[PDB]
Amino acid sequence: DLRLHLLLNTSVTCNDGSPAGYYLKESRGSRRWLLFLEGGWYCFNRENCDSRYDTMRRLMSSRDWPRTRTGTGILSSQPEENPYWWNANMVFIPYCSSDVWSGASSKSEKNEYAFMGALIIQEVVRELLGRGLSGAKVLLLAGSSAGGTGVLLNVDRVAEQLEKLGYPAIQVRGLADSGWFLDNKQYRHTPTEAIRRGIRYWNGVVPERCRRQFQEGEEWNCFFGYKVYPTLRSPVFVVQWLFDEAQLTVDNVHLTGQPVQEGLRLYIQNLGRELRHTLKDVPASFAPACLSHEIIIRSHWTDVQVKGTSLPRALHCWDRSLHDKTPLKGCPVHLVDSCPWPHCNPSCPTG
Ligand SMILES: Cc1cc(C(=O)O)c(C)n1-c1cccc(Cl)c1
Ligand SMILES: *[C@@H]1O[C@H](CO)[C@@H](O)[C@H](O)[C@H]1NC(C)=O
């Protein structure tokens, strides 16, 4: 139900130089716009990107993209599947830059690949302004996994872009799903170095205030939610499993079958405690104590609850809290599990 539009500025490209693009379903009776950033890891050097080009080419090229995609979860237009924003204008931005949405580098005689994630977002926004975004009241920049980190890296730049273009009435907000990572110690050794190298390979850019804090050579710090979030001006709602599977993968943890012994038990409990600590001062957040790779464009995203409140409800409460900072009776926005082990929340996805 979302239709593909390749960017009219064909100099804003996927990794292989094919045009980037977006899928759009308009809702003419709505001034809400949801722009969703797809995830899918990243690649950080020629050989690693060449491998990704062989077997994950849709994440590097638009050449094989389908003409349409079905909106699911928060991108669904059915109220039963999407109690939160079913009537919004829906935009799905495919991830084809492999740069955690940070890149600003074109293909050239010096560069086999283009890493243009940050420019893709800017160009999608600019082209949508002529398709009705100019009349928006709220632009929610959402994303999952690498797209969630992409929200943190780009939401304030979208806000600044709209201000400079002359649209100060559009309220830009962020929804970062599964992109809030910890630069922690691995459970067993042999990841943040890949981000350091990636930023150089991609000509990656980070938000200005965060860049000014960490300074030259240390921009990798701004890929970590707990470091970049306090520098952001736009309202950002953070969704994060306490035991995210991608976090565990980079930590070299593989929970498969046999009894967990003391060292790994302590490691996992400490990970959840650390994650919960980083969210203590994040007033809009939803952080269930689950081991999951599941994301908010999944059809059953309504099922999980923290303290009896679902994510669509929490997001609705967030909308109410941003009406023109007293908390709302029965409508919470800060929902972080306190129980210390995966699936101690009974509503965790079963897989
Ligand atoms: C930046 C990023 C994106 C993704 C992803 O799963 O999409 C991951 C695991 N990271 C990450 C990269 C290095 C270290 C850490 Cl903790 C996290
Ligand atoms: C196309 O995008 C590039 C990179 O963002 C920009 O430099 C250029 O001005 C754009 N061209 C047009 C015609 O807008």
Q: Which H helix or E strand runs over 90?
A: strand 89-93
- Specify the ligand 1 atom closest to the Cα of 251: 16
DSSP states of 281-302: T-SSEEE-S-EE---TTSTTTT
Distances (CA, A) of 207 to 150, 221, 234, 263, 320: 11, 11, 12, 37, 27
**Going by DSSP bridges, is the β-strand pair 285-287/334-336 parallel, antiparallel, or unpaired?**
parallel
Token pair for 175: 């929804």
Q: Which residues line ligand 1 (CB under 6 A)?
A: 39, 41, 100, 145-146, 149, 181-183, 191-192, 194-195, 223, 246, 250
Token pair in block for residue 255: 């929970």
Contact between 8 and 22 (Cβ < 8 Å):
no
* Structural domains in the chain (count): 1
Contact between 156 and 212 (Cβ < 8 Å): no
d(CA 155, CA 23): 19
Say whether 244 is catalytic: yes
Q: Based on the residue annotation, tell me whether 99 is a catalytic residue of this protein.
A: no
Length of the chain: 351
The neighbour count for residue 161, using CB atoms within 10 Å, is 17
Q: How many CA atoms lie within 13 A of 99 on its CB side?
A: 32
- For ligand 2, atom 5, the nearest C-alpha belongs to 119
Kindly report the number of other CB atoms within 10 A of residue 166's CB atom.
9
Domain that holds residue 21: 1-351
Cβ pair 215, 182 in contact under 8 A:
no
| Number of the ligand closest to the Cα of 7 | 2
- Is residue 343 part of the annotated active site? The answer reads no
Q: Which ligand is nearest to the CA of 42?
A: 1
Tokens representing residue 225 in the block: 């939610």
Indicate the helix (H) or strand (E) that contains 195.
helix 192-202
Do 311 and 251 meet the contact criterion of CB atoms below 8 Å apart? no
Distance (Å) from CA 8 to ligand 2 centroid: 10
- Experimental method for this entry? X-ray
Angle at 45 between CA 43 and CA 46, to 5 degrees: 110
**Annotated active-site residue in 99, 156, 244, 251:** 244
Q: What is the DSSP code string of 6-18?
A: E-SSTTSB-TTSS
Structure-token pair, residue 123: 């160009």
* Contact (Cβ atoms closer than 8 angstroms) between residue 142 and residue 312: no
Resolution of the structure, angstroms: 1.3
Q: Per-residue DSSP letters for 207-275?
A: -HHHHHHH-TT-GGGGGSHHHHGGG--S-EEEE--TEEHHHHHHTT----SSPP-HHHHHHHHHHHHHH
Pocket test for ligand 1, best of 52, 187, 227, 250 (most atoms within 8 A of CB): 250
Q: Are 6 and 62 in contact (CB under 8 A)?
A: yes
User: Would you state the structure tokens that stand for residue 85, as one six-digit string?
Assistant: 């924003």
Closest CA to 144 of 118, 120, 179: 179
To test the pocket of ligand 2, the residue of 7, 10, 12 to mutate (highest count of ligand atoms within 8 Å of its CB) is 12
